Design a protein around this ligand. Structure first.
Ligand SMILES: COc1ccc(-c2cncc3ccc(C(=O)NCCCn4ccnc4)nc23)cc1
Ligand SMILES: COc1ccc(-c2cncc3ccc(C(=O)NCCCn4ccnc4)nc23)cc1
Ligand SMILES: COc1ccc(-c2cncc3ccc(C(=O)NCCCn4ccnc4)nc23)cc1
Ligand code: FES
Ligand code: FES
Ligand code: FES
Ligand SMILES: [Fe+3]
Ligand SMILES: [Fe+3]
Ligand SMILES: [Fe+3]
Lengths: 360, 357, 357
């Protein structure tokens, strides 16, 4: 039996509850979200700086797919499943500059940076060798809002159709997105469903108790969480200890988050690549405009690494454990207040209302 | 198809065999035993001393359930599923002294030590906020025989209904139970079905060959294993005569009162899955500060005695999956019911068999 | 629906493709290969040198079965499931010289080295104790080509029926096989289907790119892969500044007689599940006291040669689960059947295919 949700699930944030627990734990729900959501949506994978020059490539894994994204010699950005068409060896590893051809490690077939088979060894002596159908298998990729998105659906349109208006507002909050460079990346296999991790991001109800260092840097009467078109913006004014330093927190469907902290001069990005119902690989990327980091930046990197990020990781991990309990009645009340203050949870209701549309 | 046993399974200990091997390995058998037995029986979790003072609390995990047991400000012992009613964060960790209210770490809802929602931050501004229906979810707990039992079955009666006479007999074996204090705990995730570990305890057929260091005290002809009602007693006199008690109680807690009757060890089996059982091996002394002779005995249990029994049940769990294991094992019951008779296994499995009709 | 193949699957190596990817990943396909192939075929486990003397024994694990192969008092080689018939404890571990009877470590039942029950403690006072049928459970074992093969099918015939002509030809490749002794064993749990590891051994298409240090001996001009009857031979001439043999035998044991013909390496594959295969990589020399050249070569295999092949099969296992991998891979057979032809794969897979009708 398949679990289904109503169309109006969390349609009313003022009186709303989180998903029945099975949606956070069921492997069958995950397998449905994997193909209905993560194989048919634009999945953000990197900032443009990782792929800015010809021959630049990166590799990612999401929902079990090892994918390579590569800027071809023609400067055309492409993405491919990272698997040789001869006998399935992976083609590239890590990140870097590709040679002028991709040489598979197992039998040294070569491919052009557009996936075309360049040379199959001993090809000429193999009967009825299919040169056309021995090329790398592509998927869609789009450079959007200064970042890179992939899509496994061959019939997808463009990122703007998925996140209407998002590219312009993000560039409004940070005017140096195009000069950012990856300063630090935190990689964690998190034992929480991807939806639990989004829930946590979508509210600051927990900042008082769970985030001491991120609690004075934020005004509760000067904090607004507005929903948009498959994304939301959490905006507020800071004063930890520019007559009004602002901060931005974007959530975009399905689960990528873009943060522009006070100053608007750098970004952190949360990438969620789901693994299974109770596992989500996370990239926590910190981006600065300078390549050689000052020590105030290196300290900031370690503060997120060792103090700030561990707090949210424990939260989502404990929640994943708790909601399997028979002592958890099943659903959790979303603490929306009618003024949408800085500790209102209504943003969770907006996210989950979108998720619910995939469970009819 | 679900496995089942004749209700007369091991009804005759003189001619009996262990479960067909699938009962030790099948996930569908385990999931049935998990709910039919471990979610509906009294599960011993601690000695009372761990919960003797107001605000004292402990946490246990059993059959996938994180449970908190907590002595309220009002001195009333209660138990709760260890999960906040708002959005599922765990409430307490480890063991110790709870504050006067429980503060959930995620959104800082407050709960009185009886589970009551005290204050949910900003509730007053949340439409249609439910007062209780947002309280901690409790489960039954009872102090019995000086120990603490929990029960996830809301319609369970009392521990005495489950173990008729056990409190009476254990208090005759050790008269200082309430003065006991936890001296040491061995936590082991053991890769054996919980029933393999009970099988192991229910017989001394193996003590000669498998426990060399535990042979210089026991007497083979002054050893008796008598069955009662959902518990059994292994009773004997030890080489000088000091007596000793080995209680097994349904489903899988064992209480040992070694010679001297002044201390106890207790085996708690918290099953995890068909082939995994969390074990607490607790040693309890009446004194707070351990002597160095007590630390040595603790060490012997930890490094010599317990490894022998853990190795046996781990090896058996592997071996009974072999296609070369014909399926069932003969229970070595003798007419005399000697110090090495295995008939106690038949009593244990006959009760288990009643849950597989 | 269960996955099936045409009988002519890879019957024509000139126009052939590897299995549809489900055959390398499906646990149902594995369970069928497990029982149709690995429980009914002769499985090579060791060289004779390990079991040459009375009471010598080894232990192996393959397809979930812990097996002991033991040379009886009477110099008769036997194989048994390594599980006591009483209550399932394992009987022996590792390799070594067994004592005149096997004494189980749980209840000290004794067995003779031919599997018969010697003495079951207290049996005399146990009602209806079955002495015949309280035996170690045997399985078939055969010494062939200087090696030892087991078979879980008690109606199995002999290894020659499985590998017709193999011993004859192997003894021509290495004339001192009976003089070999185990110098080194690399045990690796490999996350690849057993068939992926065979596919890899069956071709030298990959030696140029994947084995740089192994490239001066791999000459396409002087390298032949001929198929026979459930085994194949990759024979070539090496370049110094001498011939070499590489036998694959059904289902998955590979015997290498490298240049010089004075030593052997052997690849034993013991599949675990669809995506896990335990491998033994055995290096055999005739002398017991290794020289530094031999000690250096063992480490070259351990740190240089074998890691390259292990990475190849591990990446392939990952890659063929990709939705970007079209079902099957083209087997690169060339008309000449050169040293880089992949036709050996088609021979192997056509045989496998016979078990998937
Ligand atoms: C170092 O960057 C990060 C990265 C992640 C976050 C972050 C962490 N945890 C929970 C959260 C909930 C909500 C939000 C949000 O609504 N977004 C912005 C608010 C936080 N902000 C401060 C300055 N700029 C943004 N962020 C959260 C903050 C800072
Ligand atoms: C001290 O804690 C343990 C913990 C585990 C055991 C234990 C382990 N395995 C099998 C067993 C069979 C029978 C019995 C028994 O008769 N138990 C009663 C007191 C035995 N006693 C004598 C001297 N010291 C202790 N115990 C067994 C004993 C003792
Ligand atoms: C020395 O032991 C090993 C052990 C493993 C191999 C080996 C490993 N991987 C792929 C392979 C493909 C083909 C062949 C072959 O052609 N095998 C025949 C013996 C050729 N020879 C070379 C050096 N010495 C002997 N071997 C492969 C070779 C040698
Ligand atoms: S896998 Fe054979 S060439 Fe890439
Ligand atoms: S989860 Fe306990 S307060 Fe929100
Ligand atoms: S288990 Fe081997 S003798 Fe009892
Ligand atoms: Fe947070
Ligand atoms: Fe014991
Ligand atoms: Fe190789």
């Amino acid at each position: 039996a398949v679990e289904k949700l109503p169309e109006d699930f969390c349609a009313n944030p003022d009186v709303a509850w989180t998903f029945p627990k099975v949606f956070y734990t069921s492997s069958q729900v995950f397998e449905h979200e994997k193909e209905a959501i993560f194989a048919k949506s634009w999945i953000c994978v990197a900032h443009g700086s990782e792929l800015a020059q010809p021959n630049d490539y990166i590799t990612r894994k999401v929902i079990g797919e090892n994918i390579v994204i590569i800027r071809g010699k023609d400067s055309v950005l492409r993405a491919f499943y990272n698997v040789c068409p001869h006998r399935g060896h992976e083609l590239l590893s890590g990140s870097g500059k590709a040679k002028n051809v991709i040489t598979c490690p197992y039998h040294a077939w070569t491919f052009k940076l557009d996936g075309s088979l360049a040379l199959a060894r001993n090809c000429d002596h193999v009967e009825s060798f299919d040169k056309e159908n021995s090329s790398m298998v592509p998927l869609k990729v789009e450079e959007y809002a200064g970042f890179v998105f992939i899509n496994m659906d061959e019939n997808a349109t463009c990122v703007e159709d998925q996140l209407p208006g998002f590219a312009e507002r993000l560039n409004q909050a940070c005017g140096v997105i195009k000069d950012l460079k990856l300063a630090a990346r935190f990689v964690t296999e998190t034992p929480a469903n991807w939806k639990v991790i989004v829930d946590n991001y979508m509210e600051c109800y927990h900042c008082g108790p769970a985030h001491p260092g991120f609690a004075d840097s934020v005004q509760v009467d000067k904090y607004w969480h507005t929903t948009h078109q498959n994304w939301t913006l959490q905006y507020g004014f800071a004063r930890s200890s520019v007559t009004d330093p602002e901060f931005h927190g974007f959530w975009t469907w399905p689960c990528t988050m873009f943060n522009v902290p006070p100053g608007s001069n750098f970004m952190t990005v949360i990438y969620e690549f789901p693994v299974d119902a109770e596992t989500t690989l996370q990239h926590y990327d910190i981006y600065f405009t300078n390549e050689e980091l000052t020590q105030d930046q290196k300290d900031l990197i370690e503060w997120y690494r060792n103090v700030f990020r561990p707090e949210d990781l424990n939260l989502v991990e404990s929640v994943q454990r708790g909601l399997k309990s028979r002592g958890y009645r099943g659903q959790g009340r979303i603490m929306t207040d009618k003024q949408r203050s800085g500790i209102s949870e209504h943003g969770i209701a907006y996210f989950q209302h979108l998720v619910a549309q995939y469970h009819q």
